[PDB]
């Protein structure tokens, strides 16, 4: 005869959807001074002779991290200077030019500063992407649906990596298979407490400063037959990108409200150039050839063509990214049709980023001569609709940007109570 027996701590792990807590290494927007320090001590535990199913683009951790970075940005942005007084009619005109570049305007308005007293004229520059004409006469673009608060310069929104840990009784299993395509089973799975790397870099159509793939190039997509679901592609090797804004601009510290300081462009000292990105055309051509070869591996020897975006907004049709303080939008039609390739990039100031109804932000200018050197490591492709497949860069949903890093993490709760038979009496 046999008797049931209770063991405390057998290795059984249940499903997901619990809460994770931050952990930062040795100010900024996602408060580093508000997470517990990470004991770095890189420690894992390989689970030999196991197998389990990952379902990447349905994961919990992606949703938790996105919904949490929204709650960090929109909470650090709570106490900053608002903008409602700065929405008067703006009497603007063109700026002095020397070479063919319109784009910037020398606007002038009347600002309430000491209440029921003399109001300054207080000229200021504004891009012709932050201005709508109410037909000479103009206004801030986002003063029709939402009023937003300038991100205070004392804090900096450049990304430093975050480490998402799990509380007791919860472990994050990590799949270390090289050729893993997001979903399905995989072998050689380790267990972890705190996730690696994952820098919250916001971008579009070009994952920047992201984690490289290994061995070959992988393709991730909900259903390759479906058209509306996004497509993510990692890169065998990073493609260097070097993007510069070559101007020297002055920062007018102007008053607006008692203890309300607003920072506007003052003047451009020197030549008026265009903001632009640089890519190695030979390297990009090799990368494009390799990735299209990988995708033709996924299709029955079908010829594949690339085309730019169709009709979206400036946040979608362009490689929207965040440099050292400024917000760039680059028309990437050149890449997708020893010699470098140049991308013309327009810089925007009042942006509606994450596409919220009720949110925008004013980005105070940086004092000129800003450069960003980064690595393209990801491609966000979608196809629409004869015997040909056409791929276009495509964004919209920001979650995919987090999905490209957390593709190898799931959260599981431990079930320590196990029951099994043996010869034991009482």
């Amino acid at each position: 005869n046999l008797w049931v027996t209770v063991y405390y701590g057998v290795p059984v792990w249940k499903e997901a959807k619990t809460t994770l807590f931050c952990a930062s290494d040795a100010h900024n927007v996602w408060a580093t001074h508000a997470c517990v320090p990470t004991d770095p001590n890189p420690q894992e535990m390989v689970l030999e002779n196991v197998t389990e199913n990952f379902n990447m683009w349905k994961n919990d951790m992606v949703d938790q991290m996105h919904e949490d970075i929204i709650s960090l940005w929109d909470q650090s942005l709570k106490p900053c200077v608002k903008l409602t007084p700065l929405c008067v009619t703006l009497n603007c005109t063109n700026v002095n030019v020397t070479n063919t570049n319109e784009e910037m305007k020398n606007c002038s308005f009347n600002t309430t500063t000491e209440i029921r007293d003399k109001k300054q004229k207080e000229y200021a520059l504004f891009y012709r992407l932050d201005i709508v004409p109410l037909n000479s006469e103009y206004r801030l673009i986002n003063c029709n649906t939402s009023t937003c608060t300038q991100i205070c310069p004392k804090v900096s929104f450049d990304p430093i990596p975050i480490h998402y840990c799990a509380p007791a009784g919860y472990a994050i299993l990590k799949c270390n298979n090289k050729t893993f395509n997001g979903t399905g089973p995989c072998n050689n799975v380790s267990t972890v407490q705190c996730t690696h790397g994952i820098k919250p870099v916001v971008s579009t159509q070009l994952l920047l400063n992201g984690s490289l793939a290994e061995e070959e190039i992988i393709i991730r997509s909900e259903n390759l037959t479906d058209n509306a679901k996004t497509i993510i592609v990692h890169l065998n090797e990073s493609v260097e990108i070097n993007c510069t804004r070559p101007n020297n601009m002055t920062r007018k510290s102007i008053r607006i409200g008692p203890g309300q300081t607003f920072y506007a462009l003052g003047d451009i000292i020197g030549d008026i150039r265009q903001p632009h990105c640089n890519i190695s055309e030979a390297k990009w051509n090799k990368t494009l050839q390799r990735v299209k070869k990988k995708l033709k591996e996924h299709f029955p020897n079908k010829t594949i063509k690339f085309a730019p975006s169709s009709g979206g907004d400036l946040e979608i049709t362009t490689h929207s990214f965040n440099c050292r303080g400024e917000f760039f939008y680059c028309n990437t039609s050149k890449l997708f049709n020893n010699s470098t390739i140049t991308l013309p990039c327009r810089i925007k100031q009042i942006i509606n980023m994450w596409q919220e109804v009720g949110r925008c932000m004013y980005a105070p200018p940086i004092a000129g001569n800003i450069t960003c050197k980064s690595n393209i490591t990801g491609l966000l492709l979608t196809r629409d609709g004869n015997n040909t497949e056409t791929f276009r860069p495509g964004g919209g949903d920001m979650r995919d940007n987090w999905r490209s890093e957390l593709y190898k993490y799931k959260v599981v709760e431990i079930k320590p109570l196990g029951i099994a038979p043996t010869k034991c009496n009482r």
Partner: protein
């Protein structure tokens, strides 16, 4: 924790100390404070639920335990040596997962019968 999970049932039966140990710690103001506060309340609630389940059975404070109830064959007719040397704990649970609730009810009432038998004093 989650150690010999790949090893056999018997092999896992020998290395269960780490899961028992690492349950009240790790592997060793609404910004983030509420997040970690809710996490560390959830941790202690999980630990206390395990303690309660062990208490209402005859295994309060024991890593190894035996009971008086022998189970019926319908749940599993597999041989002992095959059971403890061929598969892992997870597939065993998946085989039993349809019956886990019934055994816990059987466990708790068995304890009540045992205590009342010992309560004759």
């Amino acid at each position: 924790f989650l150690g010999a999970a790949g090893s056999t049932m018997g092999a896992a039966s020998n290395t269960l100390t780490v899961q028992a140990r690492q349950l009240l710690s790790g592997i060793v103001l609404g910004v983030w404070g509420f997040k970690q506060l809710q996490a560390r309340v959830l941790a202690i609630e999980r630990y206390l639920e395990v303690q309660q389940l062990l208490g209402i059975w005859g295994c309060s404070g024991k890593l190894i335990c035996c009971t008086a109830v022998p189970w019926n064959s319908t749940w599993s007719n597999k041989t002992q040596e095959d059971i403890w040397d061929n598969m892992t704990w997870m597939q065993w649970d998946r085989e039993i997962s349809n019956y886990t609730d019934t055994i816990y009810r059987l466990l708790e009432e068995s304890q009540f019968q045992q205590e009342i038998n010992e309560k004759d004093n």
